[PDB]
Amino acid sequence: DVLPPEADSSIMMLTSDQKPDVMYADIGGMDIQKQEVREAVELPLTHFELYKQIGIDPPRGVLMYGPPGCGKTMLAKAVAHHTTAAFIRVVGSEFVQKYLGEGPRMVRDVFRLAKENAPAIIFIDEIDAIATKRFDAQTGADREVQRILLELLNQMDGFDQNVNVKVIMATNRADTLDPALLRPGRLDRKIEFPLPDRRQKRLIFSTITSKMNLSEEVDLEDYVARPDKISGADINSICQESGMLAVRENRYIVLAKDFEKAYKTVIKKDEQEHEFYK
Amino acid sequence: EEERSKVDDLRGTPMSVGTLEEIIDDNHAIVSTSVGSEHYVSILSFVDKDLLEPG
Amino acid sequence: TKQYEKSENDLKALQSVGQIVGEVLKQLTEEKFIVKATNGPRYVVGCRRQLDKSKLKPGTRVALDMTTLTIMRYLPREVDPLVYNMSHEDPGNVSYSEIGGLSEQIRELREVIELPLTNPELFQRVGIIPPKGCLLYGPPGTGKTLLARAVASQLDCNFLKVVSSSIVDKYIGESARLIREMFNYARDHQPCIIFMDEIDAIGGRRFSEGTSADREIQRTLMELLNQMDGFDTLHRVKMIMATNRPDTLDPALLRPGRLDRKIHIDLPNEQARLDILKIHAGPITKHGEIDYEAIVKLSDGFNGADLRNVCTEAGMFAIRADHDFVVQEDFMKAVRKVADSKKLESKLDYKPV
Amino acid sequence: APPALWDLAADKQTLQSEQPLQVARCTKIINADSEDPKYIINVKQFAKFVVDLSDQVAPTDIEEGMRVGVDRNKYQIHIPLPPKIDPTVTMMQVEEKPDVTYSDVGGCKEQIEKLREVVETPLLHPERFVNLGIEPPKGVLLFGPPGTGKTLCARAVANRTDACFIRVIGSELVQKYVGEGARMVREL
Amino acid sequence: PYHSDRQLMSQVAVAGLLTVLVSFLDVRNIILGKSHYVLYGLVAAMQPRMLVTFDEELRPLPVSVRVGQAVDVV
Amino acid sequence: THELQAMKDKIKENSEKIKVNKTLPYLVSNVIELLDVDPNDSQRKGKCAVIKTSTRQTYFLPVIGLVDAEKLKPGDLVGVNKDSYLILETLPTEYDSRVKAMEVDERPTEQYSDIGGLDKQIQELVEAIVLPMNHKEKFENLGIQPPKGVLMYGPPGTGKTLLARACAAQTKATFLKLAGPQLVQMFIGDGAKLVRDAFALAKEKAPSIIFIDELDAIGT
Amino acid sequence: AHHTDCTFIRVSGSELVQKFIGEGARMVRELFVMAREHAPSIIFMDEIDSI
Ligand SMILES: Nc1ncnc2c1ncn2[C@@H]1O[C@H](COP(=O)(O)OP(=O)(O)OP(=O)(O)O)[C@@H](O)[C@H]1O
Ligand SMILES: Nc1ncnc2c1ncn2[C@@H]1O[C@H](COP(=O)(O)OP(=O)(O)OP(=O)(O)O)[C@@H](O)[C@H]1O
């Protein structure tokens, strides 16, 4: 006999009945990148038919980039509140074993239980570990796991046509990614997280401050003024550092003191003494 | 003649492809094949043992 | 006389061979269990009636027969280096007072480290999420492993010791999966604290694409960073990190979330230098005349280490004078001179941020 | 064909000698010596074993890190084997045969005199210096324009009498995958 | 030079210790070695042949006692 | 009352039967300590420990047989014979070949009397090395922390190697030479376990002295 | 090359064409060995046209 299927081996699927953390109402910054995620994820997930009707083929390849700030995985945590489907959470490095022959069983299982649970979604976090060229036999086992990347790549041509999978992906540095993946036909979607702007500033200030006890003295406009001239960031965890300069006390309702003092706490690096070029 | 029908049985039917690592004057030669297999083989046949050389 | 026969009867029980370890992948039926050995091969076996079928579960460490290859006994978890991460010992406590400065850093890490453990209420009321991480860096000054060390032996509770050189692993960077399993046992003994000494090497940039080592190191770094990007609640685990240069650590570690706090050691002020000099003058027997402001005026810009080595230099120079109690004039001489030799060898102490 | 006839006809005695000492797989270095009879051993099989030796070997012939023959089933030490080395690089550097004798020198005399008495005289007549000792110097140095470098070396090859000498080219030291040329220079 | 022969026959004779055949070999090489005074060449260039050589070298083929010295007339 | 000698005969006969299981504690193996009791499904109590192998494999065994969990925390090298998967004897110590013994010095013949002009700096050296040996009681009287690292620099020569190794032969204490670039290795962080093994055999041979040169080669 | 039916090849190619083809060398003689096995053949330069 063979696997039932699909009885694994490893991973496994789910863990998403005890998860995700919080809904997409958390972050309000993007509103555009989340719309490309929308039309590129759950518009195809609900309709395979309307594409064949209109005559445009939707790709399963999704790639996100731009960090920091984070974004990225929070769109997956938010996707698990958006959608009811399959969820593959695998650290890009997690599967590297002592025997190279375990790789193909692992990833092959991933894909056959994915199409088993189809409509499905697969996510691998920062393949940049496995996306670099190498030769020597010691890492040549890892050359067999990038041969595994090409294996599951051929399988990612095998999901077509129609039902189904969603391959989403993100990385902290996309330079060393070998283009074979990103090149058209397999991963067709390049998403870039932008640095937060004045819209994203005010939206992130409102959404992080909505979860803390804040004083009526505290102004958001001055901090979409002076930090917006430079930052940048991570702005969320900087307001968290404001509530954490309130947690320096013994504090009741946080004041603009701990706010401004946290913006000068984290962080400003001034350039330059030599700036008199301009 | 009879030697062809003799040495083939000893070396037959299967035989591994090995790599000569280094030579000991006993006619025993330290050999290597996948993986990490060293050994002493003293044979007078087919050799040519001078021209073998390691590697 | 009879106790020996008790041991020999134990040998009769030793005629039973040790069983073979394995994991539970799934189970196809009650007489078909999809299992794997720790050595790689996968199998499907039935089992005896002494099991509880529900207790089995997937991803379970079990022991198999040598022939039937089936579960007789099982154990939940095991890890070799953990107890050795728990076996660190440090005196003090009192050394936490001995270090002198730096006060606001001391109390700061006391709050962000100790306070989420004892008082989650203060945080959960205001609406603020507790910081899960912190960073220390010398030697702009020094005292990193001292301070944090006396925090591990101070707060006690559960604490885990890590040197960056134990993640080397040679073949198959599964020291990565030792970070995974290590974090799982930090989820076992939680709340726990994590040391990280010399995080530059295990924090590198992979700036220039090259060789192999840098790549697999960066791979274990992907494991670290994605386990701080959870998908997991690290509230209950603490992490303390110390390195020479906060430069090569990459924006991923430099990003909050993963690394919330940033604290440094600085060169001790003549006040703190005064204090640490006080506590270093205690163990050494001295002559009736003592004046610390002499050494405080003379000693400038030393590390706290360089200052205690300056005190030891005073005493060990005073073994030549053979006096038991030693004047601070000999301390001014040897301390001053040899200290200034340390400052001639003090080349390139200026580090990034 | 006659030499190959007699060559293949010795396999009848060879197969009788093939039964014993064949078990020599594999070469293995010890790690520590637990007690007088017992030695813990590591073999490139990557399994490690504590065992005695074949009693024809004197137990005082073994040192730590000594590659030793084995009887694979008992794992006992068979015979101590001297060589622990070498990758073909060093024997590639191991040199033989002379050429380009002395008179091929182009008239350089003080040079050839000093660089001659510094190698031949201590090596040809060692007793002379031991009498007058003192000591002859460790090593020498040559350099200058290309003409003529490396040719007087060929002369040292010719006039070389008994003990061979090992030529080492400069580039074979440097290799990628750092730490290779170190093992190299050490083992040579 | 004769020093190298002196060192070879001097070092190889350290063995046995006697084993008097080593004090036989040290003179053996210098029979022809230090004999000299005759060049051969072949013997000979004119195409004759040495008569003592074939004769004597036929006997010690089963070399036993004094046949080797009879041949050692050479 | 004479039956005690009968049981003596059976314990010696069983000891002779132990000898056949003691030959030989062939395979070296690594340990993972555990003490477990398994209720059923009526009751089975005792201790059960985990074991690795020299061939990288892993087993689970009812506790040896011979010596108990008295030793140790998860160790290694425990001697176990082939298919037995039980450890007759727990053997030390550690490892490994070139790393175990980098240098074992009898003594170099030269001494400080062969050098001159260094009497001040060799007074500093003879201080730093000799005062922990004999004069430790003086430290405990004064409350002194002795020096450890002592830097040695200068263009050859100097001849600081004959200094350090000469007086190292005058110490009579255990001495290990070491070359700086030796710590450069073929795989990632071999030099780490190398140095840890070095300081482990040094702590075993305490007091001892380890001399390294060309630190700047590996200290860049 | 599609209408000519001669086999179509693009140049390096990463990373893994150094794997399949040859071991280590100038390597264009081994790629040229494949182009000799399959003839006629087209070699395209992919892409190395960039800013
Ligand atoms: N509106 C927001 N904009 C930007 N970042 C936010 C926002 N809300 C929360 N965050 C941050 O996102 C972090 C978690 O994001 P995630 O787990 O995706 O990290 P990541 O994207 O993998 O990291 P990085 O992209 O920096 O490598 C939290 O620590 C939080 O500080
Ligand atoms: N503030 C201080 N108080 C007391 N001792 C100190 C202080 N700073 C440094 N030291 C001394 O320095 C020695 C080393 O401890 P420390 O943790 O400073 O090393 P380190 O910071 O890793 O050194 P480096 O940064 O130079 O590698 C200790 O013996 C300690 O006594």
Ligand SMILES: Nc1ncnc2c1ncn2[C@@H]1O[C@H](COP(=O)(O)OP(=O)(O)OP(=O)(O)O)[C@@H](O)[C@H]1O
């Ligand atoms: N003084 C000389 N006497 C004899 N032969 C000479 C002399 N100078 C040059 N030659 C001949 O010229 C040729 C070239 O010199 P050679 O190549 O040995 O120097 P080189 O190897 O270039 O020196 P380097 O190793 O510094 O490059 C030699 O074959 C040698 O026979």
Ligand SMILES: Nc1ncnc2c1ncn2[C@@H]1O[C@H](COP(=O)(O)OP(=O)(O)OP(=O)(O)O)[C@@H](O)[C@H]1O
């Ligand atoms: N001041 C001195 N006193 C005694 N001997 C000396 C002195 N200076 C040089 N020598 C001699 O010079 C020779 C060369 O030693 P050298 O200077 O190379 O050692 P070193 O420099 O300590 O070693 P390294 O080169 O590894 O630092 C030695 O044999 C030593 O006897």
